[PDB]
């Protein structure tokens, strides 16, 4: 021990430094060195190694993950918190950082903190999945109003038919049928005659079908269809099929008309 | 720039925040020189 252990450390330590100096980058050398000092619980040294590695190549996302991870493993919550903040500040586009950052805060129990992080994240107008994760985050607690608010922003950030449909569906799931109807009205109002198609109108039909408004469904089906592009052809066919199904839920006149 | 404006005493409380040394006007760490 006392001296015998020490010599070992010099041979390893010196070797690590030699490797780094030779190759400079090749951050597997940086990382291995950091890991070894971490294992010996010399974490102040480890921190300096990670910072030095960052000076060489701050864009490398494995490096940052290993750094933050190291802090968390040693229960150094506030160091980890700092590091996460830096990572997202300098490389905002990396989604891995955001997902881990919110997860850490959630584990720590800091719901407010996590919310704050997500609000920062959303400023970057990221990706469908990120928005879903934010909404799901809210839905692990009741917080339905918060969820709906997020959706309100989301369907305008990424104004894709599908997202609008999803939003409506969300309302359906939680029985806000009055609001779901309104959402569908908003969607069709927004998209307008210019562009709208199959999916949304079908979904709306299904909604009213489930609401037991069959006559209304037919009105919607017919009026909105005639009001817009119809025939594209595949979409039209799908719509027709849906209509037929609804009807089912003398009367085979269009069977003859389609054939003839 | 009148005497009233230039030399009006800085207002109100003094913050003990500064050590006898910290409270002194300075240009160069050890004191003020000119």
């Amino acid at each position: 021990d006392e001296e015998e252990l020490n010599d070992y450390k010099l041979r390893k330590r010196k070797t690590f430094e030699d490797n780094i100096r030779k190759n400079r980058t090749v951050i597997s050398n940086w990382i291995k060195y950091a890991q070894w000092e971490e294992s010996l619980k010399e974490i102040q040294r480890a921190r300096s190694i990670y910072e030095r590695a960052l000076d060489v190549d701050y864009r490398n996302i494995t490096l940052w993950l290993k750094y933050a991870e190291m802090e968390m493993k040693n229960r150094q919550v506030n160091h980890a918190r700092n590091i996460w903040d830096r990572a997202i500040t300098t490389l905002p586009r990396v989604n891995q950082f955001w997902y881990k950052y919110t997860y850490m805060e959630e584990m720590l129990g800091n719901v407010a903190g996590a919310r704050q992080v997500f609000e920062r994240w959303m400023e970057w107008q990221p990706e469908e999945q990120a928005w879903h994760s934010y909404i799901n985050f809210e839905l692990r607690y009741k917080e339905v109003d918060r969820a709906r608010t997020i959706y309100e922003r989301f369907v305008l950030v990424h104004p894709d038919v599908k997202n609008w449909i999803k939003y409506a569906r969300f309302e359906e799931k939680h029985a806000y049928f009055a609001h779901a109807r309104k959402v569908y009205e908003r969607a069709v109002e927004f998209f307008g005659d210019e562009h709208m198609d199959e999916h949304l109108y079908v979904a709306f039909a299904k909604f009213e079908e489930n609401q037991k408004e069959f006559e209304r469904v037919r009105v919607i089906y017919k009026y909105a269809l005639d009001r817009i592009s119809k025939q594209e052809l595949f979409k039209n066919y799908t719509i027709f099929e849906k209509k037929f199904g609804d009807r089912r839920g003398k009367r085979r006149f269009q069977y003859e008309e389609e054939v003839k | 720039p009148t005497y009233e404006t230039m030399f009006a005493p800085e207002f109100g409380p003094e913050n003990p925040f500064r050590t006898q040394q910290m409270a002194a006007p300075r240009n160069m760490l050890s004191g003020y020189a000119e």
Partner: protein, 173 residues
């Protein structure tokens, strides 16, 4: 009466929410909100620098701003006169610098200069008893046949925050 943080006349030590009553020497650098809004999380990045020096960090910075018309006073080249000022100040400053560099190529100082000093120790027994002292600074005469005194060659590795970047299919892979 309360005896807890929850709840001058009291004549009690009371600390109402969380003002610390024992030494901590805590590391944390105060979180800040500015005017109406935001916890200033961008304060991380500035940390090394002075407030004066700018640093982009928020998403807003990244997002586009449009138009600005054919022209507006907003984008224009300072002016003739600003340029003249800048150019002249620059020119003089550079020349000073150059002359120092050029001092090598061309191998005499005679100023006696006085200074007045305030100490920071004071105490009335520290000097004979003066709030100030005066020092006459004199430049030491250099022996012209003296060789370079000491050795400069020694070499030490280059020193190390990155600005945010703000910028694949299987088949393609």
């Amino acid at each position: 009466i309360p005896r807890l943080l929850e709840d001058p006349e009291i004549h009690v030590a009371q600390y109402p929410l969380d003002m610390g009553r024992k030494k901590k020497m805590s590391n944390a650098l105060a979180i800040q909100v500015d005017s109406e809004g935001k916890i200033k999380y961008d304060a991380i990045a500035r940390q090394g620098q002075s407030k004066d020096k700018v640093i982009y960090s928020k998403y807003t910075d990244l997002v586009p701003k449009e138009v600005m018309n054919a022209d507006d006073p907003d984008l224009q080249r300072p002016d003739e006169e600003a340029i003249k000022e800048i150019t002249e100040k620059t020119r003089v400053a550079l020349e000073k610098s150059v002359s120092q560099k050029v001092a090598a190529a061309m191998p005499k100082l005679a100023p006696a200069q006085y200074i007045r000093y305030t100490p920071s120790q004071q105490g009335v027994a520290f000097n004979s008893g003066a709030k100030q002292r005066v020092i006459r600074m004199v430049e030491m005469q250099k022996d012209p046949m003296e060789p370079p005194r000491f050795k400069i060659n020694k070499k030490i590795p280059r020193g190390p925050p990155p600005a945010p970047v703000m910028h694949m299919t299987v088949k393609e892979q």
